[PDB]
């Protein structure tokens, strides 16, 4: 119901690669969130995700709760590396 990564993107989770990671989680039914520095937000929210300011080298944990958990989590893990964000 979740996976953890280390952001490799030098720009961290921001700009288009962040709009892309949001777009992706939004294509699901489950409830996807982002855990960072002890703060969890809705991975389907632009403001939420961008209000965290996740820099490079940080550790994050995307969680999924719904009828398509593994699918969301797996698709996002694919987006994570497809976008060079982390793994």
């Amino acid at each position: 119901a979740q996976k953890t990564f280390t952001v490799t993107a030098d720009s961290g989770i921001h700009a288009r690669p962040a709009t892309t990671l949001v777009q992706a989680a939004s294509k699901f039914d489950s409830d996807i969130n982002l855990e960072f520095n002890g703060k969890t937000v809705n991975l389907k929210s632009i403001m939420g995700v961008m209000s965290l300011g996740i820099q490079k080298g940080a550790t994050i944990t995307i969680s999924a709760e719904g009828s398509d958990e593994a699918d969301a989590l797996a698709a996002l893990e694919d987006t994570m590396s497809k976008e060079g964000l982390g793994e």
Binding site: H14, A15, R16, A18, T19, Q23, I46, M47, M50, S51, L52, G53, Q55
Partner: protein, 275 residues
């Protein structure tokens, strides 16, 4: 009654700074099925105020406004607007108009503080047009506050204003180098000017960061297109435009708004212009 198209007023789309904010806005508008009507104002209050009517007179579901100087008169007309208006990378003291930015004053302070923590006592500030509130009200104050809190002098000859152009950056270092007590570190309020400051000093033979450390602001792509690579305060241009648009879609679609005054996180990307 509603067109699903928001209008965006911007000083100059050809400036990398504003072009970056525009891309974020545009991306999010697209995401939320909106159209944008971009218009350049060139920091002309008359043009700016006029362009406001135009957009409203073409009935737009929203307005994103950007400007180096949001005056009382601007605020008055913006409060009158029939549709939600969100300010991007711009400020007005009363906070009556929604806006998305970063904590400029705090970011300038952190920048200078790191130069002080590095053993610098003579630190200058090359600023953009001092008239613009982000400069005299925030960046300057953050710079001064970092100085006073460390019990350092706050000399006005250590603050020279540029005009955001790479050349003014050059002219600024030369003027600063004419000072008897030469600064050892320089905080520049913009990446383009910081490149001019770096070059103007290398043309005078000094070495960055050995003879002079430098820090810029915005962390644009120019920061990595210099040698040494510019240490720069990070302002997420794209996020600011993106989030300012999202905030706008919240007002437009009447969603739950936590705050109309948003300050995205900032940090400093340390590279080679600093030790």
């Amino acid at each position: 009654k509603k067109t699903t198209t928001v209008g965006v007023i911007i000083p100059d789309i050809s400036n990398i700074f504003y072009a970056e904010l525009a891309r974020g806005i545009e991306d999010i508008a697209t995401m939320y099925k909106y159209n944008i009507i971009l218009s350049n104002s060139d920091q002309n209050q008359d043009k700016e105020l006029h362009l406001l009517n135009n957009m409203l007179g073409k009935q737009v579901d929203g307005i994103i406004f950007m400007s180096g100087n949001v005056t009382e008169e601007h605020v008055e007309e913006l409060k009158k607007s029939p549709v939600p208006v969100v300010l991007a990378a711009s400020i007005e003291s009363t906070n009556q108009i929604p806006s998305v930015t970063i904590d400029y004053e705090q970011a300038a302070f952190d920048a200078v503080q790191s130069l002080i923590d590095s053993g610098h006592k003579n630190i200058a500030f090359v600023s953009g047009t001092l008239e613009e509130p982000i400069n005299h009200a925030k960046k300057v104050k953050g710079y001064k506050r970092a100085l006073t809190e460390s019990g350092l002098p706050v000399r006005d000859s250590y603050i020279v204003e540029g005009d955001y152009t790479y050349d003014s950056g050059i002219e600024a270092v030369e003027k600063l180098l004419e000072e008897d007590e030469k600064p050892t570190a320089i905080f520049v309020g913009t990446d383009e000017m910081a490149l001019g400051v770096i070059h103007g000093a290398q043309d005078r033979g000094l070495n960055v960061p050995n003879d002079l450390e430098i820090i810029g602001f915005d962390n644009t792509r120019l920061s990595t297109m210099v040698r040494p690579q510019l240490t720069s305060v990070v302002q997420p241009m794209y996020d600011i435009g993106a989030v300012a648009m999202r905030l706008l879609t919240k007002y437009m679609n009447k969603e739950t708004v936590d705050s109309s005054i948003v300050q995205l996180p900032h940090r400093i990307e340390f590279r080679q212009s600093t030790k």
